[PDB]
Design a protein around this motif. Sequence first.
Motif, mmCIF file in Angstrom:
data_model
loop_
_atom_site.group_PDB
_atom_site.id
_atom_site.type_symbol
_atom_site.label_atom_id
_atom_site.label_comp_id
_atom_site.label_asym_id
_atom_site.label_seq_id
_atom_site.Cartn_x
_atom_site.Cartn_y
_atom_site.Cartn_z
ATOM 1 N N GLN A 34 36.700 40.185 -84.613
ATOM 2 C CA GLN A 34 36.569 39.973 -86.049
ATOM 3 C C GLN A 34 35.209 40.466 -86.524
ATOM 4 O O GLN A 34 35.074 40.947 -87.646
ATOM 5 N N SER A 88 40.858 43.291 -77.788
ATOM 6 C CA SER A 88 39.644 43.273 -76.980
ATOM 7 C C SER A 88 39.877 43.840 -75.585
ATOM 8 O O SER A 88 40.734 43.362 -74.852
ATOM 9 N N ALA A 89 39.106 44.860 -75.222
ATOM 10 C CA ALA A 89 39.247 45.456 -73.904
ATOM 11 C C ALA A 89 38.859 44.449 -72.825
ATOM 12 O O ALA A 89 39.476 44.415 -71.760
ATOM 13 N N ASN A 90 37.831 43.643 -73.091
ATOM 14 C CA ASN A 90 37.348 42.662 -72.117
ATOM 15 C C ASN A 90 38.026 41.288 -72.172
ATOM 16 O O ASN A 90 38.152 40.630 -71.131
ATOM 17 N N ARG A 91 38.452 40.850 -73.361
ATOM 18 C CA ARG A 91 39.108 39.546 -73.498
ATOM 19 C C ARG A 91 40.634 39.607 -73.482
ATOM 20 O O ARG A 91 41.291 38.648 -73.078
ATOM 21 N N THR A 92 41.205 40.714 -73.944
ATOM 22 C CA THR A 92 42.661 40.854 -73.935
ATOM 23 C C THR A 92 43.061 42.194 -73.318
ATOM 24 O O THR A 92 43.695 43.017 -73.967
ATOM 25 N N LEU A 149 40.050 58.193 -81.296
ATOM 26 C CA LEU A 149 38.762 58.390 -81.948
ATOM 27 C C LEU A 149 37.983 57.088 -81.808
ATOM 28 O O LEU A 149 38.528 56.003 -82.021
ATOM 29 N N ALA A 168 30.918 48.960 -75.109
ATOM 30 C CA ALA A 168 32.174 49.297 -75.769
ATOM 31 C C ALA A 168 33.159 50.086 -74.912
ATOM 32 O O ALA A 168 33.070 51.308 -74.794
ATOM 33 N N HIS A 169 34.121 49.375 -74.338
ATOM 34 C CA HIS A 169 35.124 49.977 -73.469
ATOM 35 C C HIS A 169 36.467 50.189 -74.156
ATOM 36 O O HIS A 169 37.342 50.866 -73.619
ATOM 37 N N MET A 209 40.104 47.063 -83.118
ATOM 38 C CA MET A 209 38.695 46.718 -82.974
ATOM 39 C C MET A 209 38.560 45.566 -81.988
ATOM 40 O O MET A 209 39.465 44.744 -81.860
ATOM 41 N N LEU A 243 45.664 45.280 -74.636
ATOM 42 C CA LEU A 243 45.230 46.655 -74.823
ATOM 43 C C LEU A 243 46.136 47.608 -74.046
ATOM 44 O O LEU A 243 46.586 48.621 -74.579
ATOM 45 N N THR A 293 46.289 47.642 -88.667
ATOM 46 C CA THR A 293 44.916 47.245 -88.378
ATOM 47 C C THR A 293 44.962 45.996 -87.514
ATOM 48 O O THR A 293 45.382 44.933 -87.966
ATOM 49 N N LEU A 294 44.513 46.126 -86.270
ATOM 50 C CA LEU A 294 44.575 45.015 -85.336
ATOM 51 C C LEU A 294 43.305 44.752 -84.542
ATOM 52 O O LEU A 294 42.405 45.590 -84.470
ATOM 53 N N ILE A 295 43.245 43.566 -83.949
ATOM 54 C CA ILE A 295 42.123 43.192 -83.103
ATOM 55 C C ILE A 295 42.660 43.241 -81.681
ATOM 56 O O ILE A 295 43.673 42.615 -81.364
#
Lengths: 159, 161, 159, 161, 159, 161, 159, 161
Positions: A12, A38-42, A84, A69-70, A9, A46, A34-36
């Motif tokens: 948070q 970020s396409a834009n921040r990390t 998905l 949402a990328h 996702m 990714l 289950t992890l965080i």
Amino acid sequence: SAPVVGIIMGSQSDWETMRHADALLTELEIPHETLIVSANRTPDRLADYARTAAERGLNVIIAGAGGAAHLPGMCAAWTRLPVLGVPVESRALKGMDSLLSIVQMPGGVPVGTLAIGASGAKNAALLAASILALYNPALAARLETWRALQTASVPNSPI
Amino acid sequence: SAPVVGIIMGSQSDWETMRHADALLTELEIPHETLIVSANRTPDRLADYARTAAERGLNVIIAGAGGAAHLPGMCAAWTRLPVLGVPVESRALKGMDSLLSIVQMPGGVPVGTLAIGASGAKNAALLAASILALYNPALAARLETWRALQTASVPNSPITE
Amino acid sequence: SAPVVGIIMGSQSDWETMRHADALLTELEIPHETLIVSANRTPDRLADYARTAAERGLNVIIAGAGGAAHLPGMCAAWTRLPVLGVPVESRALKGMDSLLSIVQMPGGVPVGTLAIGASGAKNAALLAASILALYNPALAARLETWRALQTASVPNSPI
Amino acid sequence: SAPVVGIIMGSQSDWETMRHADALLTELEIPHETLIVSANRTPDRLADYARTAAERGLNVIIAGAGGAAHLPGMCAAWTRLPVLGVPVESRALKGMDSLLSIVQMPGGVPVGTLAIGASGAKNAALLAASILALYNPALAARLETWRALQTASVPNSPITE
Amino acid sequence: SAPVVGIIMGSQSDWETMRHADALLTELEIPHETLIVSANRTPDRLADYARTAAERGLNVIIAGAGGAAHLPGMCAAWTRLPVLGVPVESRALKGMDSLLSIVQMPGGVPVGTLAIGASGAKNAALLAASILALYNPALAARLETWRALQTASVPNSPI
Amino acid sequence: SAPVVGIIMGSQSDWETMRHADALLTELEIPHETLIVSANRTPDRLADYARTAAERGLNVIIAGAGGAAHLPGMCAAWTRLPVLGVPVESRALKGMDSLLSIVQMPGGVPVGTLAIGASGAKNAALLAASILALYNPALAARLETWRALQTASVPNSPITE
Amino acid sequence: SAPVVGIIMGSQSDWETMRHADALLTELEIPHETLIVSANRTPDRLADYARTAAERGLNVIIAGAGGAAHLPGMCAAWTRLPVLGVPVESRALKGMDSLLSIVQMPGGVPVGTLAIGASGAKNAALLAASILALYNPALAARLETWRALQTASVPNSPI
Amino acid sequence: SAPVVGIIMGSQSDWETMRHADALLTELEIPHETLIVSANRTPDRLADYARTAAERGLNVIIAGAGGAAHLPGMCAAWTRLPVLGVPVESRALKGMDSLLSIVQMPGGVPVGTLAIGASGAKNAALLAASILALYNPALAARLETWRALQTASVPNSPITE
């Protein structure tokens, strides 16, 4: 024991929504992580995650994010595995931006998109389960039971 | 020769869009069947099709429909198999009605939805392929090669005329 | 005494909205049944319900559902009776998904659609009443009175 | 010969869409009248038409209009008869203005709304027929046969060219 | 003393929004009447009101309604006077249905439409004032003062 | 001769729109490069392009893409340079999907978004020029003259035929 | 010390949103001014502000407004400086009106538009920072640090 | 001969729509001027036009523009006269951007907005006429006759071919 489904996702803030995917997989006893991410921040996090997913034994990736949402689309860009996507409800546009940013992927790089919000997170887990069930007899039976209980449990009249 | 993927659509008018799913599965050498099943005109045909899909050997169902597109969702209501939905573009609302009618399934009955139109049809086939590839090494190799070629085939600059 | 109108809804969550249809029919003394029937969770229950509706003496069916609302359309697919649809307001898209999923039925299988929410539930009951009134003189008079009271009761100035 | 259904529309431009309702009623042998009544240009004509519909023998009214489509709702304000509304597709907003202007009636004054365009017009006629069929055995038989044929006429597979 | 502006609204529920139009007219000392007139529930009341408006001395009519808002358009259908419409914010669609139902009038029967909600009610009163100002010097001066105070009162920096 | 602005787009189909950005930069004499970089088909090419943009001398990046337009946002994720996004009009949704996919970036990773289509492409170039003009007196003079001419060239009345 | 970035907003009501732009610039130590300038209520104030911006030493202007948001576009009409626009979330339409009114500028007069709401205000400041960084080495380093901290601070798993 | 209504538009491309306002005012014998004033390209021309409108004898201003349509609102910001806005249909968003940019004026600065396109232009002229008719008996008589004819000219039934 090793995860076969990866739930990622954008932040948070998406947990309130994605926790429903986590709960469903746990309910059906499907090993997952289950992890965080970020396409834009990390972006590099990714790239590495999506690129190595298959090698690590993952079979399906569930990605949730809101707004522009990328995450799902970019994840799909780096992996051959089915991705998905869960459009997280955004504050202003109520997830319409999330939905269009995820579902409108151009031909060539698919993202199986589910409903906006909690329903979508729950359904992404169920869809992942139905995919795994194609080659896991035990799980297939647990999924049949899950769907059967859902159907049988619907009340006949409102309270 | 037995089909492992079933492509269903609400009407002949949906074929212009769904043919892209058919073409891609054939390209990847994935056995499949293609039929017309109307959720509103042939509800019982849909019930029977969806209910017996698993026992008939199908692994994935790709359903395409437009407007009040109930075909994907109702198919998923009757089968335990993963169902992928393709929103067929509609005349007035440009597929927005098609999209919302498919993607907004309530928790408990999933439909993996793709983009409105031809892109969605092609991606439904590709998604189905990626699912089957999880347990079919040969197909997995063909898909890997397909994705790799796609990436390598992108031009570096536009033909600025 | 036997129900002539059937009110069905996708889930208990729709009751808050559909109870308005129930109250209206009771107000006009129209015999009816109020049930929960999910197009996506209980498809066979819906098939059986819609298929046998006419045989059971039902004249009109009022179906309410939200999100990807397939209940009204699928009900209409199995019955020759007039089916009226109530788009239940959804959390994210405020019933726009509900509305389009119900009203956009293709030529051949109609669904008389009412407004999103409570207003729609109330109007589906009134529309059903106006249909029954065509062949029930007593009810026709009660409906005339209902409409007359509504009109006469509107205040002339705001408080 | 006396009409039992009245089809009204805001202008001649709506006929291209409403003719489908006319054609279907005739197909099912349902006596009806077809007129142009403008809610914005002939408000008094609408008042009189709607007010006297019941006494004139009409059982159902099908009203079609586009844009700021007030015709269906205002007709319902004056008659106790069930009113079905057809959102005529508009140029700029593709019938979305037509749809919202018709379907969003406040509690107390119903308008059974159908889909935007030709499909809605055809369904308004079919809905009207299903209403009349409740007390007309002959029509009920014709409708049953019509619905049955529709279901039986759906092809099993697309003409994949 | 006799009203020159008529403010009509579809129901008591619209008062929360239309009261802003009432307050503005009172502020500018413009004689007016404030009434409830439902296009759908009291059609004949509306017909009579709009038809006789000019004869009664009204110069401008401000009509507010929400949802399938037919009040402004139908009022304009019966009067030659300028009709200004206020889209009242609806629960589900936030006044988008109200807006399109009012602003999209076909050529031949105009309705000067203002913004959704309170801003729109306030602006309909101001627009009516600017219309009356064209032939009422005293009012024109009060309007100039009102606009001048508005402009001069805007702070230079946020608190 | 070294480029100071980079124009990237998701596919050749985007060129019809992005050529307007190219033409304007050339008009203002701003050195630039024009390439095709697909966020979904060539993710690694995008990573490398964006990551090395600053060291390669680029000052501004103009990215155009349609549909699920991730190109601008992902480019911004990898570069510290200002990124301007052009929503390319899409077939079904008329660029609304393009627009939301670009402008709704979450706090922390900006994309200065312009209008859907040709106007946005032209304005992306003009915005880039106004940025460069802040530290390039010669360009600042050319831009001032360009804006002044635009204002002076507006006709006072329409050609009422 | 002299401001190089000007933050202007249509009203005090926009402060809740624009304060995020102010905080970011202060965080990166970018000298700036924060003012209220209404395109509709104080048009001459806006004209003077935009017209003299460059002369006063401003390099970038961040303009935020909601509803029929004309502030960014009109500001850009009077200045050669880059103008960044922040669509403030509106009550009824949730900033969709704000967004379209700002982003759809015709070719010839650009406005770099950011997301609706707080995210947009924060990003307008960051975008302005990235612009200034092109000719301010010290700031460029602080921006690199800011972006680096953002990326490194994203958690790996949800709490 | 002195104009009492001013019709302004953002560009020559708006004329196709605004000509309908011009034609109607002329039909009703209402003296008026028609000009092009760009809110984004000629801001000072707009300021001067709007500021001096009242002293120049104008009573009503009809402003038409599309896309980020700021012309009507900014005109109203500078004049105390009533300003009517016409949303010109835009290519991608079909005038929705035009409509929201005009109608959503904040409390304090009104713009009486009409429908998107030609209908709005015609109605802006008719609205302006109804305003002027309040203090011009001759015009009031012409308008009454015009409205009466419109109502009497509506056909009673469609030409069902």
